[PDB]
Each structure stands twice: as C-alpha cells, then as structure tokens.
C-alpha cells in the first residue's frame, strides 16, 4: 500500500520536500538511469532497489503508451519521487539518502525564526 | 567527574572536543535521560519546556558551555554533553559522539 | 512540547531469543526516531538512526522499524553482552526533543 515503507521511509518523508527540487522524468531517464546500472537486464535481482526501480520504468513506460496511444495530466507524476529514491539510494547509499530525507524533514517541521543556519545535503 | 556546589549558587560545565551544533542532557541517579537543549552552529540555543530559565546553554570558538542558575536540591544528576556528527548543524536527529558526562552534586 | 512513550519498562529475553521495544510519539516525527544503548557508568551508545540505520559497528540483530508515531526497536539475537538500558528520543523540530523513560532489558539465565 506504500511503495517506501519497507526501504525505511514513507510517502510523506518525500513530500517534504518541494516539487520543484527533483528532475524531470526524462532526466531521471536516459541521464542517471541507463548510464549507471547498465546491467539492470541482468538475471540477477540485486539489492531491491534495482527490482523495484525496474517495475518502476517499466509503469512509466506503460503509462506513455496508453498516453500517446490516445493523443498532459502530471498530477501521475510521482514516479519522478520514485527514480530519484531508488536510484539515489542505489548511488548515493541507501542510509545516507534515508537520513537526509529524515534530515530536510527536520528542516521544515520547524518555524523558520528557529531554523539553524545550513540546510541538509 | 564530580562537581559539589551549595545550593543555589551557579555553576558552569564546560565540554570540548571545534564548533558544530552540540547539545546537553541530564541523567539523576537511578533516573533515565532529560533532554535539555540544543546550541547551533550559529549560536542559537533551544530549551525544553521544563529547563527553560533553569538551565544556560552558551558558546565559543573552543568550547560549549552548560550553566545552571540558582541550583535546587533536585538539580544533582549527571550531565552529558553530544555533538552533531558530520555537518549536520542542529536539526540532526541522533548524536554518537558522547563526552564522558560530569556528576553534579547539589547539598549543604 | 513533544513527549515520547516507551512501552516496555523492563523485559526479558533469553539468549537466542528475541526481545521487542517500541517507541510512540505525541506527535508525528517523520523517522527522526533513532535509539540509543546504555549500560552503567557509560555514556549513552547510539545504536540506530533514522528508521533502520545500524551506524557503523553494531550486530545486525539490532533492527529498527517504524513509520509516523509508531516505531519499534527489535533485537532478533540476544547475548549476554545485551543486558542494559535502552532508550529512544525522536526530533519534532530543531526545537523540541524528549528521550523516552528507558527499557531495562534483563537476560534470561
């Protein structure tokens, strides 16, 4: 029911953070996506990033038929959350991406007079 | 690892290390951990609810320092001092690095 | 104020066993739970942060779960070397933080 919830995070973990910071699809595509990790097709199944990142393109794939078969809506647009997660945690290390979701959680949830003088990376 | 003072007269426990976002708690004997409060990496010290006023949370260049005012009898526990670890900067969530703490003991 | 429940107090395990705390908060903490081992005389150890993070040298049996104001500690394999006093604080905000009242865990023998 919560596709984060097992790798230690939750859906609203990522909506801390403003839309705007994470890339595009097609950036999150091609550009991080075919580059590193070429050996997805592998018959391996490594650390369940790479099994759940595959399921992921493959939906966004199969969203895009259907979209251009009939001709818009980004509201469906979540898997832009979900590339940068999985991938981010396969490159980057799954704690420290984990922490610094948990640490920005930290940076809103607190009144900005207060805020100390760094933001997380 | 002891401190004696009557009470109340102030006292000021210091803790070192450089300067990033450290913290203090206090642990009574035979009691668990209280927090008390936060000092950033610029300066800005936070409280809880309880230690608001009780309790000074300053610093410097070399040092982090901790004062009580006008110490009670239920004031005597042991005081811990944690720093942020890695960059962090006061909205970290758990602190590894621990001083070895300072037993305060508050009595005539 | 943020104010955080433990609730197990104290409990018992044997070795080999398994022993569960769990960790509720007053108000939603969004994983900035983390716990902390202690035993008499030493300052307080950090075992995990975050919800499942085991920082640097700590034996896997150490497992953290959780999401919202829920979150658990489990230690799967329990030794001997386990018998002490756990805690848990959590971050509301860069302001408010409280540790929970602590779990002394005893070993079965």
């Known amino acids: 029911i919560d596709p984060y919830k097992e790798f230690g995070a939750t859906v609203e973990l990522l909506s801390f953070l403003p839309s705007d910071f994470f890339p595009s699809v097609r950036d999150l595509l091609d550009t991080a996506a075919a580059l590193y990790r070429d050996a997805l097709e592998s018959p391996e199944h490594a650390s369940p990033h790479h099994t759940a990142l595959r399921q992921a393109i493959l939906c966004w794939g199969d969203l895009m038929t259907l979209a251009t078969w009939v001709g818009n809506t980004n509201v469906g647009l979540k898997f832009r959350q979900l590339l940068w997660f999985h991938i981010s945690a396969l490159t980057f290390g799954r704690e420290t991406v984990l922490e610094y979701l948990v640490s920005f959680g930290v940076w809103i949830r607190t009144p900005p007079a207060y805020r100390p003088p760094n933001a997380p990376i | 690892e002891g401190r004696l003072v009557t009470p109340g007269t102030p006292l000021t426990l210091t803790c070192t290390g450089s300067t990033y976002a450290m913290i203090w708690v206090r642990q009574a004997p035979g009691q668990g951990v209280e927090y008390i409060g936060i000092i950033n990496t610029g300066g800005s010290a936070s409280y809880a609810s309880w230690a608001k006023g009780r309790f000074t949370i300053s610093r410097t260049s070399t040092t982090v320092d901790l004062k009580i005012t006008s110490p009670t009898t239920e004031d005597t526990a042991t005081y811990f001092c944690?720093?942020?670890?890695?960059?962090?900067?006061?909205?970290?969530?758990?602190?590894?690095?621990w001083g070895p703490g300072t037993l305060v003991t508050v009595s005539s | 104020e943020l104010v955080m429940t433990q609730t197990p107090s104290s409990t018992s395990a044997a070795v080999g066993g398994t022993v569960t705390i769990n960790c509720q908060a007053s108000q939603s903490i969004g994983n900035a739970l983390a716990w902390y081992q202690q035993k008499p005389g030493q300052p307080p150890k950090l075992l995990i942060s975050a919800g499942s993070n085991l920082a640097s040298g700590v034996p896997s049996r150490f497992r953290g779960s959780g999401s919202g104001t829920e979150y658990t500690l489990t230690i799967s394999d329990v030794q001997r070397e386990d018998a002490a006093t756990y805690y848990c604080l959590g971050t509301y905000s860069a302001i408010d933080r409280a540790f929970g009242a602590g779990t002394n865990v005893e070993i079965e023998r």
């Open positions: 944690a720093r942020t670890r890695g960059v962090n900067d006061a909205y970290e969530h758990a602190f590894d690095p």
